[PDB]
Amino acid sequence: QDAITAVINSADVQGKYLDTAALEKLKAYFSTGELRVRAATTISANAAAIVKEAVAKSLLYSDITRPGGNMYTTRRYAACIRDLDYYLRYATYAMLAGDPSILDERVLNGLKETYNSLGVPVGATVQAIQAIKEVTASLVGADAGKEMGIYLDYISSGLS
Amino acid sequence: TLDVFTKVVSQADSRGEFLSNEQLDALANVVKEGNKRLDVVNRITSNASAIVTNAARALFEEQPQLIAPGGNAYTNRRMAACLRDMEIILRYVTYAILAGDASVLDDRCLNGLRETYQALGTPGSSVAVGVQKMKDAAVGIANDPNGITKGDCSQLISEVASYFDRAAAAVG
Amino acid sequence: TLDVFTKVVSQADSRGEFLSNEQLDALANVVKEGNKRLDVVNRITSNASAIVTNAARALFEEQPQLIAPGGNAYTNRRMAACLRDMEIILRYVTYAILAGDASVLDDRCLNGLRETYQALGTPGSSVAVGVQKMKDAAVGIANDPNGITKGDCSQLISEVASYFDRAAAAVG
Amino acid sequence: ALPLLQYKPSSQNHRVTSFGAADQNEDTPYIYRIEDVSSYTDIQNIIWASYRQVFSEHEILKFNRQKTLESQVKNGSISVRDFIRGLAKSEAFYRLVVSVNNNYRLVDITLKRLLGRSSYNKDEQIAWSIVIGTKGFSGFVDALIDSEEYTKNFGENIVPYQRKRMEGRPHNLVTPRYGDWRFTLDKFYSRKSQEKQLREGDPRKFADLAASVGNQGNYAQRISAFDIDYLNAVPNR
Amino acid sequence: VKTPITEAIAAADTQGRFLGNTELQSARGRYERAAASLEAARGLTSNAQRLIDGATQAVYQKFPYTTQTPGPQFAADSRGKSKCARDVGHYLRIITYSLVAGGTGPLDEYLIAGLAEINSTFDLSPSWYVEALKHIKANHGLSGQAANEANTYIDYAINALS
Amino acid sequence: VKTPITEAIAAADTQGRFLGNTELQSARGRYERAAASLEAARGLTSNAQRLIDGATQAVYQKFPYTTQTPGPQFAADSRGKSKCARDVGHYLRIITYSLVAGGTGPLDEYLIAGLAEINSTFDLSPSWYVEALKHIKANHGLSGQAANEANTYIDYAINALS
Amino acid sequence: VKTPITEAIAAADTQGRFLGNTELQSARGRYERAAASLEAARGLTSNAQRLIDGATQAVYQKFPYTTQTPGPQFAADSRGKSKCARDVGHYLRIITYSLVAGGTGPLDEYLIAGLAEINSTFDLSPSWYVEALKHIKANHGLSGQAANEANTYIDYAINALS
Amino acid sequence: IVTKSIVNADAEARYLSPGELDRIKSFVAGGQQRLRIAQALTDNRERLVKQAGDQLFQKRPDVVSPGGNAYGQEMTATCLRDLDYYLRLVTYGIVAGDVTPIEEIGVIGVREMYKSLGTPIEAVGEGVRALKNAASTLLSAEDAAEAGSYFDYVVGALQ
Amino acid sequence: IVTKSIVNADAEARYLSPGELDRIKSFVAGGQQRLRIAQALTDNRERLVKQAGDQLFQKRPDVVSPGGNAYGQEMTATCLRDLDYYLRLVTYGIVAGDVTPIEEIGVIGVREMYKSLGTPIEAVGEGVRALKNAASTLLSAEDAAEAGSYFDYVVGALQ
Ligand SMILES: CCC1=C(C)/C(=C/C2=NC(=C\c3[nH]c(/C=C4\NC(=O)[C@H](C)[C@H]4CC)c(C)c3CCC(=O)O)/C(CCC(=O)O)=C2C)NC1=O
Ligand SMILES: CCC1=C(C)/C(=C/C2=NC(=C\c3[nH]c(/C=C4\NC(=O)[C@H](C)[C@H]4CC)c(C)c3CCC(=O)O)/C(CCC(=O)O)=C2C)NC1=O
Ligand SMILES: CCC1=C(C)/C(=C/C2=NC(=C\c3[nH]c(/C=C4\NC(=O)[C@H](C)[C@H]4CC)c(C)c3CCC(=O)O)/C(CCC(=O)O)=C2C)NC1=O
Ligand SMILES: CCC1=C(C)/C(=C/C2=NC(=C\c3[nH]c(/C=C4\NC(=O)[C@H](C)[C@H]4CC)c(C)c3CCC(=O)O)/C(CCC(=O)O)=C2C)NC1=O
Ligand SMILES: CCC1=C(C)/C(=C/C2=NC(=C\c3[nH]c(/C=C4\NC(=O)[C@H](C)[C@H]4CC)c(C)c3CCC(=O)O)/C(CCC(=O)O)=C2C)NC1=O
Ligand SMILES: CCC1=C(C)/C(=C/C2=NC(=C\c3[nH]c(/C=C4\NC(=O)[C@H](C)[C@H]4CC)c(C)c3CCC(=O)O)/C(CCC(=O)O)=C2C)NC1=O
Ligand SMILES: CCC1=C(C)/C(=C/C2=NC(=C\c3[nH]c(/C=C4\NC(=O)[C@H](C)[C@H]4CC)c(C)c3CCC(=O)O)/C(CCC(=O)O)=C2C)NC1=O
Ligand SMILES: CCC1=C(C)/C(=C/C2=NC(=C\c3[nH]c(/C=C4\NC(=O)[C@H](C)[C@H]4CC)c(C)c3CCC(=O)O)/C(CCC(=O)O)=C2C)NC1=O
Ligand SMILES: CCC1=C(C)/C(=C/C2=NC(=C\c3[nH]c(/C=C4\NC(=O)[C@H](C)[C@H]4CC)c(C)c3CCC(=O)O)/C(CCC(=O)O)=C2C)NC1=O
Ligand SMILES: CCC1=C(C)/C(=C/C2=NC(=C\c3[nH]c(/C=C4\NC(=O)[C@H](C)[C@H]4CC)c(C)c3CCC(=O)O)/C(CCC(=O)O)=C2C)NC1=O
Ligand SMILES: CCC1=C(C)/C(=C/C2=NC(=C\c3[nH]c(/C=C4\NC(=O)[C@H](C)[C@H]4CC)c(C)c3CCC(=O)O)/C(CCC(=O)O)=C2C)NC1=O
């Protein structure tokens, strides 16, 4: 769903026409879409650098990459990079849509089930998503970093 | 000489890192409160000589040994020196009100001030009686609303009662 | 030291009467023009060292006797004294820009300045060549608009060109 | 406005007559007079030795020196006594000495740098302290230079100097212008991270081996991408 | 003569350094104040003869002493009362000068510089002028912000008197 | 350390007189621009690592000399390039200090007070830093009024260098 | 201007006492020394054009930077290279002046008195001249004792540069 | 961008929906600015390759170092020829309005090509970043934004 | 104090009785004085820890003595850090108006912690008493009373 599609749905289930508050919501979305698109472009620029900096901030040189940790095996390191790239990409989609429903529908659906099945540590994942959020808020600026951090904190809060 | 702006610098310089946006928002009170600082000092120095001469009748009300013959505030030269020092605290107080931090008052008013009363013979603890007999007149002149639109300067006011309380405690 | 505010006082004091409402309305330009004064001096002193070193290649472009052996600007101490005096005019110019009246520049920069060139041997009239070779760079830096909001800055540029013209004429 | 209260002058070296002008040792300071200029390098020496008394050598810097005053002194427009006043009533002196020093300390330092004489006792420091507080600092400095101890002894046109320092320590070296529990617990935190034990499979164990192998990488080729001429430089086959 | 512009000059000249940003903001503040202070300047010159003759009578009401006893100091004769409007007429001039100057500069030199030494000689009691100004403090009729700044220079001359 | 508030103090203390209206307007001016300078302060600390590594590379592009020749002065070794981010990392600190202080105070003592004497000794050519700052002058990305005042302290350090 | 004879004068004049035996030995030392220094003086003026054009090329070999980039500071244009022989031509003059004077006197005033302030302005990097003189230090071809004393004033100007 | 909407509506059995016709009309309107941006990047190519090689070899000296791939005049000429190729594909993507004719020729199999050539891909990404910086200096603000668009796509693609 | 009344009326099946609403309204009225007292204790923390360490090590020198726990710079830094923690919890209790968020973090298991650390609890109580004396000197009378309230709770709790 969108913010546009959410506004249209909320006006639809009442049978209501588009009143002035919904037009205010759509015009606010059409105002913010500029920096939304620019932020999505520069996040699509260097996603690999963001994931590299995030694991170098949070996960590297810990016991997690040591033997016994969950990132010791090299296929598990590759799976870690894959999961962080997923979090960043779906946070980019939720930032450009302006509605976190795609995070609820595509990422946060059965994810705690999987992470408790595999024995994946949840708190280290939350700290890695936090480091992702700090790196991309530094990279994109504060004004779009707020909206990026909202959906990354949404993923972090639903994960916990 | 220091400030509330430059103590934040020197606190950050001894750490040696850029100032955070959490730090500057707390400093953004002061540019709003600079509207409130700038007239409370203007209220004191407008009525500066009224505070001094009214509190000259308060230390001399309670302790009449000072104009007793043989007293330490007794003679005309000595009594003119009392008034010479009755408002030498008020300029150093009103400097600290404008600066907002008491590092001006602590190296010019109180730095070694206690030492001379053990040297001359003038009673140190008696000056601490009359100095906080100024602040009830200083706060009482600075607090009452006349003309100026109603606003809350109570938070700022505590600061003013703190500077007299600091200067009186470090004398006696 | 004088001002545009205090020359009006001293003009009225030598008359000895209250200032008219015709007089204060003309002075009300200056509180509006104080928006325009305060950055044209900020434009000059930001590029102060660029003006001096570029105009050090203009007097020394046209008159190459100055680094000729036996010249008066010849040796290293003498040439360092040229730069010592190439911007000692610019601070006294920018003082008069901020003050708005040239009574600061006339008792600190030009008061008896001509007398020393008849005493030392350094050519007086050559400094007047290079000083108005600063103002085409000074006006040319202060006039161009990049970034700043469009405004009628032309009005006091004729003041700025007048102060260099006064200081150059009273040297040579 | 009130007169100075009468205080106690102690015995010191300056009070003594120190009779004669052939008799002094060489250690007596070179009294630089503006009247005997001789050559520029006596002007430069007069100006530098004025800074030295006032700023104690280290300070001269670049910013601290008022460059304009030095030029005037050479011209002769302002006396040397007028020039040290302009140095002492400078803010490059004020942010240096006055902001760091106590009122009673400031009497002792200014008397050693401007008058060349240490304070008699503490009550002489207490006696002048009132003068600084009401008149201002430049009220006090202007009261030192106008005072009778300065004008008879140093004259109109001599830099100040410590007088009769035969059995004493030079003033600049003896007296300067000056007068944390969370850090020691933070270094406790750094020392307790090294003492546990590096875990197995660390990067530090192989660090020593890397040093043994050495091999700093190769230097830059230096060929510039503007002069490569890449369209002509590519070969077929 | 003191002015917040000329305080930015003389502090910059004794240091021997240029006009940095830390002196230009000093002249910035005065400009904002100057517009405000000029509204207090027009408030006083329009009420020139009203304030002077109001305050001169306000001295005689609280002090009936100076109107009765003979002497060159007091104002029993008309030449005293003629010199009454000399002084308070000169007091309101420099107050109007200090508002247009933006500082306490002309009030420092013209009025309070030697004021403590004349009054010891000519028997002019400073309690006469200090309550003359209190009538001007209450009866200037100004409002808003300019009523505060015109009130500032009045009780600056009061603390110089007492 | 200099501040337009502490210039209103020390000018009032050497005169030995109170805080008149001609020093309160000096602090009044700083308050008006206090909000303005802080918007330039937030503009620089958010771009800390962007401006430093941008300007450090901007030195090497115009000066390919310092990256090649061996010596303890230049930055051929990594310890030179490590001390490259020391200096320009320290340059942007005091520029952010001078904006929050409102004056050239901390920039006077911390940076330019002995700067002419170190560079004569360690062979640090001041043309290196003076064009490092010109990259910070162009690439800070600030707009409006705060873009001017952040531009003010930059070319105040330039005139101290040259 | 400094001279071991004029150091015996000014030290005798500030004391206000005559020329004792403890200043005549100062003059005496220089006379023995002067004959030796003059052999270094003839060694340099005979090699005037050889040393200048040798050292000027010796700057460009170690520094290929100053011959290429455009600018008024460097010597890409011929007028830079014309002013190249101005400076090093003026450097060898005062070195020959300091040998015949017997002291560091003319080298103090003529060369190194304001040298730290010009080079901060005109972007003349002092590492250029400090290695220009090192070529003169090695290639003067002097021998014996005069080769040491001509080597003395060269690395006195070096320590003034760095 | 017309092939994108055409195969997009062609996978469906529906026609081109008129919102897609609106985006085609808007691209048709912006085509003149696209052509001016492409010609401005066209005529100034050798400056851009020079400054890109400048900023790259200042940034990463290992290609200059003899263990790296771009060692010697022939290899550094091949390196600047690769940067010329990527600038050419960026101009193609600027004209086409959508990144298909540039990804089809420069992106879709580049990782295995550069892996079996020995060169690192991160240095190529830094080279396209240097091209983006030089073209940002060459163009105006609204032109540098729209060029840094496709340059940004290439930089994200090579990583 | 709102959680106190809420769980108090929540154990019962009744609503919040309006006397509890009166006490919540009165606490809401006094919250501004609470915030000023908390900020005054906030900005002057290092003075309070300095004077507390002063008065404690003057009162009990056995922590200074090598048989005691706070011997050496590291242990005395940990000691002043503990006093800093307790001042922080006192400011929390000053804002919250009731001693629950300070007892939950500093009181509820402190005796066994300090027993298995070796430190005596009476010296910690004397340290909080010294903090109360220094804050009584720092504040006005009606502020020192209301601060010595929660300081008094901590002193009674550590014993
Ligand atoms: C789009 C939303 C989405 C996510 C997140 C997702 C995750 C996911 N992560 C997995 C494994 C994994 N996930 C992790 C990740 C981590 N372990 C750690 O220690 C770190 C805290 C964290 C990385 C930041 C690791 C190490 C494995 C490897 C377990 C294994 O395969 O043996 C698996 C098992 C199979 C596979 O990777 O191919 C799934 C399905 N699937 C999804 O569809
Ligand atoms: C440095 C020279 C200077 C001064 C003196 C100054 C004071 C000053 N105080 C003001 C406001 C004010 N000042 C006060 C102060 C108080 N009200 C009370 O009832 C309390 C008892 C007291 C504080 C203890 C208040 C309440 C306002 C209302 C407007 C505002 O918030 O600024 C304003 C707002 C603008 C105006 O009045 O025109 C000014 C100018 N401004 C200056 O430029
Ligand atoms: C040893 C020499 C010496 C003298 C003479 C002296 C006088 C002197 N008289 C004073 C007050 C006073 N002086 C007087 C005297 C008079 N007022 C009148 O109404 C009458 C006209 C007049 C007496 C004939 C009065 C009534 C006070 C109290 C005034 C007040 O408290 O405001 C005061 C200030 C307050 C004080 O300590 O009491 C001094 C210092 N001080 C000295 O050290
Ligand atoms: C009598 C003793 C004496 C010396 C030596 C002296 C040097 C001197 N050389 C200067 C400039 C210069 N100096 C040089 C010399 C050099 N620059 C280079 O690129 C080369 C590396 C190097 C020569 C080897 C050049 C090219 C200029 C002109 C620079 C400019 O105009 O900005 C200047 C400033 C402008 C001038 O008047 O020409 C002085 C004062 N002045 C003195 O009074
Ligand atoms: C190229 C010729 C030119 C100049 C010179 C120019 C200057 C200029 N400065 C202005 C404003 C201003 N300029 C300043 C500058 C400052 N205020 C301070 O207190 C600071 C110390 C200082 C900066 C360091 C300020 C504060 C304003 C307020 C209006 C605005 O934001 O533009 C305006 C706004 C329009 C107007 O004043 O009519 C003009 C015209 N405009 C031009 O066309
Ligand atoms: C006004 C109070 C006052 C006094 C007294 C005073 C004394 C004084 N005595 C001095 C030296 C001296 N004083 C003496 C005195 C003596 N030798 C003996 O055998 C006798 C027992 C004794 C004299 C009765 C000697 C020999 C020296 C020179 C010591 C030296 O230079 O090593 C000096 C150092 C040189 C000088 O005269 O300037 C001072 C300052 N200064 C003062 O301001
Ligand atoms: C044609 C280019 C050129 C210039 C400008 C130049 C200046 C120059 N100014 C000098 C001195 C001077 N110049 C000044 C100037 C001033 N004092 C002040 O306070 C004012 C700010 C300023 C006058 C407006 C003073 C006082 C001296 C002598 C200082 C001294 O000898 O102590 C000297 C020293 C010897 C001599 O004059 O003969 C030179 C060579 N030489 C040149 O070749
Ligand atoms: C800026 C900080 C500062 C202070 C406060 C200061 C005080 C100070 N007070 C003094 C004397 C004095 N102070 C007093 C004061 C008093 N007599 C009383 O009865 C009252 C209780 C009390 C005043 C309220 C008296 C009577 C003297 C003269 C004592 C004597 O000469 O014996 C003196 C010696 C003479 C002089 O004024 O120079 C100093 C230095 N100096 C400083 O630098
Ligand atoms: C807080 C304000 C502050 C600054 C900025 C500062 C700079 C500063 N940089 C220095 C050296 C240095 N500075 C640099 C920096 C550079 N050299 C280059 O090649 C590049 C062109 C350039 C960086 C862009 C290097 C490489 C050194 C070491 C040089 C040496 O050791 O000789 C030194 C002398 C040695 C030192 O302690 O490290 C100081 C004092 N000091 C200060 O207190
Ligand atoms: C238009 C689509 C297209 C691409 C992408 C392309 C790449 C390409 N790069 C090549 C070589 C090369 N490519 C590079 C690349 C680099 N230098 C470096 O250090 C960096 C990592 C990078 C550029 C800055 C180097 C050094 C060679 C020569 C390698 C060798 O000779 O083995 C070659 C083999 C030689 C040739 O025939 O040109 C191809 C085909 N060719 C194409 O037609
Ligand atoms: C906010 C709630 C909270 C409390 C209460 C707390 C107590 C606490 N006190 C500790 C140590 C300590 N605590 C003290 C205490 C003292 N010095 C003395 O002599 C007195 C008895 C007393 C303070 C004046 C000492 C000396 C140590 C170090 C003991 C050791 O190293 O074994 C430690 C272990 C080291 C550490 O990780 O800091 C904890 C956890 N920590 C908390 O997070």
Round to whole Å and give the CA distance between I52 and F42. Answer: 38
Residue H151: both structure tokens together: 């340059």
Please tell me the experimental approach by which this structure was elucidated.
cryo-EM
- Ligand with an atom nearest the CA of residue C78: 7
One-letter amino acid at B141 equals: I
**F151-154: long-range contacts (C-beta < 8 A, 24 or more apart)?**
F151/C46, F152/C42, F152/C46, F152/E21, F153/E21, F153/F95, F153/F98, F153/F99, F153/F104, F153/F107, F154/F95
CA dist G35 → G29, G31, G41, G98 (Å): 11, 7, 10, 14
Q: Kindly state the tokens that stand for F27.
A: 């602090």
Q: Which of E12, B78, G72, C79 is nearest to D5 (CA)?
A: B78
| G143: Cβ contacts below 8 Å, ≥ 6 apart | none
To 10 degrees, what angle do helices F48-62 and F78-101 make? 130
SS (H, E, C) H93-118: HHHHCCCHHHHHHHCCCHHHHHHCCC
Q: Burial-class residue D107 by CB neighbours within 10 Å (0-12, 13-18, 19+).
A: buried
Render chain F in DSSP notation, one character per residue. ---HHHHHHHHHHHTT----HHHHHHHHHHHHHHHHHHHHHHHHHTTHHHHHHHHHHHHHHH--STTTS-SSSS-SSHHHHHHHHHHHHHHHHHHHHHHHHSSSHHHHHHTSSSHHHHTTTS---HHHHHHHHHHHHHHS---TTHHHHHHHHHHHHHHHH-
DSSP designation for C150: P
- H helical segments located in B47-153: 48-55, 59-62, 76-86, 88-99, 103-108, 113-120, 124-131, 135-142
Q: Which residues, in sequence order, are bridge partners of residue D90? A: none
Nearest CA to ligand 7 atom 39: C78
Residue of F91, F122, F125, F134 to test ligand 9 pocket, by largest number of atoms within 8 Å of CB? F122
- Residues with Cβ < 8 Å from I10, sequence gap 6 or more? none
H79 labelled binding-site residue? yes
Q: Whose CA is nearest to atom 42 of ligand 1?
A: A107
> Which residues, in sequence order, are bridge partners of residue D158?
D33
Contacts of H118 (CB under 8 A, 6+ apart): H69
Residue G37: its H or E element: helix G21-45
Q: Is residue F160 within 8 Å of C49, Cβ to Cβ?
A: no
Query: Which residue has 């640090």 as its token pair?
Result: F124
Other Cβ atoms less than 10 A from the Cβ of C94: the count is 25
Q: Can you spell out the DSSP letters for D15-66? A: TS----SSSS-TTS----BSS---SHHHHHHHHHHHHHHHHTTTTTTTTTS-
Q: Mapping DSSP to helix (H, G, I), strand (E, B) and coil, where does residue D158 land?
A: strand
I109-146 b/e with 16+ CB inside 10 Å = b?
Answer: ebeeebeeeebbeebbbbbbbbbbbbbbebbeeebbeb
Helical pair E78-101 and C4-15, crossing angle rounded to 10 deg: 160
Residue where the block lists tokens 């015109």:
E150
Q: How far is CA H49 from the centre of its chain?
A: 13
Q: G14-22, long-range: CB within 8 Å, 24+ apart, which pairs?
A: G14/D30, G14/D31, G14/D32, G15/D21, G15/D24, G15/D26, G15/D28, G16/D21, G17/D21, G17/D22
Query: Is the C-beta atom of F72 inside 6 A of ligand 9?
Result: yes
Q: What is the resolution of this structure in A?
A: 3.9
- Residue D61 CA to residue D55 CA, distance in Å, equals 10
- Report which DSSP code applies to E154: H
What is the three-class DSSP state of D193? helix
For an interface test with H, the pick among A4, A46, A88, A140 (most H C-beta atoms closer than 10 Å) comes out as A46
Joined together, the tokens standing for residue G24 give 């005549």
Q: Which residues of F151-160 are buried (b: 16+ CB within 10 A; e: fewer)?
A: bbbbbbbbbb
- Which member of F147, F152, F162 has the closest CB to residue C46? F152
CA–CA dist G58, D53 (Å, integer): 44
* CA Rg value for chain C: 19
Rg of chain I on CA atoms, in Å: 18
Indicate the DSSP class of residue B86: H
Cβ(F130)–Cβ(F162) below 8 Å: yes
Number of residues that this document lists for chain E: 162
Rounded CA-CA distance I86/H26 in Å is 66
Spatial separation of the C-alpha atoms in residues A152 and A107, rounded to whole Å? 12
Q: Record the tokens describing residue A72, joined without a space.
A: 């010791």
Residue A44: CA count within 13 A, CB half-sphere: 19
Q: How far apart are CA C143 and CA C140, in angstroms?
A: 6
Residue with the two structure tokens 């910035």:
E28
Burial of residue D131 (CB within 10 Å: 0-12, 13-18, 19+) is middle
Residue nearest to atom 28 of ligand 10 (CA): H75
Judge if the beta carbon of residue F113 lies within 6 A of ligand 9. Answer: no
Using CA atoms, how far residue D166 sits from D13, D117, D169, E61, in Å, is 8, 13, 9, 73
Nearest-by-Cβ selection for F159 from C39, C48, C147 = C48
| F7 CA distance to ligand 4 middle (Å) | 41
DSSP string, chain A: --HHHHHHHHHHTTT----HHHHHHHHHHHHHHHHHHHHHHHHHHSHHHHHHHHIIIIITTSSSSSTTSTT-SHHHHHHHHHHHHHHHHHHHHHHHHT-THHHHHHTSSSHHHHHHHTT--HHHHHHHHHHHHHHHHHHH-HHHHHHHHHHHHHHHHHH-
Question: CA gyration radius for chain F?
Answer: 18
For residue D110 the two structure tokens come to 């200014």
DSSP string, F56-97: HHHHHHH--STTTS-SSSS-SSHHHHHHHHHHHHHHHHHHHH
Give dist(CA B10, CA B13) in Å, integer. 5
Which residues lie below 8 Å from residue A26, measured CB to CB, with a gap of 6+? A3, A4, A7
Both tokens of H44, joined, read: 């100034």
Contacts of G161 (CB under 8 A, 6+ apart): F120, G112, G115, G126, G129, G130
Q: How far is CA H66 from CA B47, D42, H75, H76, in A?
A: 82, 61, 11, 11
How many angstroms does the Cα of residue H56 sit away from the middle of ligand 9?
25
Q: Determine contact, residues F31/F64, Cβ cutoff 8 Å.
A: no
Please identify among residues 83-122 of chain G the ones whose CB lies closer than 8 Å to any CB of chain C.
Answer: 86, 109-111, 113-115, 117-118, 121-122
Helix (H, G, I), strand (E, B) or coil at I21: helix
Q: Is F18:E18 a contact under the CB 8 Å cutoff? A: no
Residue E141 phi/psi, 5-degree rounding, is 70, 10
Longest dimension (CA), chain F: 61
Q: C49, C54, C77, C86: which to substitute to probe chain G, counting the most G Cβ within 10 Å?
A: C77
Give the Cα separation of C152 and I12 in Å (integer): 76
Give the three-state DSSP class for C58. coil
SS3 (DSSP) at H154 = helix
d(CA G47, CA H1): 77
Structure tokens of D219? 């230097």
User: Half-sphere exposure of E115 toward its Cβ, with a 13 Å CA cutoff?
Assistant: 20
Report CA(C47)–ligand 5 centroid distance (Å).
17
B63 lines ligand 8 (CB under 6 A): no
Q: Position of tokens 């994108």?
A: H4
- Strands (DSSP E) contained in G10-123 are none
Element (H, E) at D196: none
Q: Does D139 touch chain F (CB under 8 A)?
A: yes
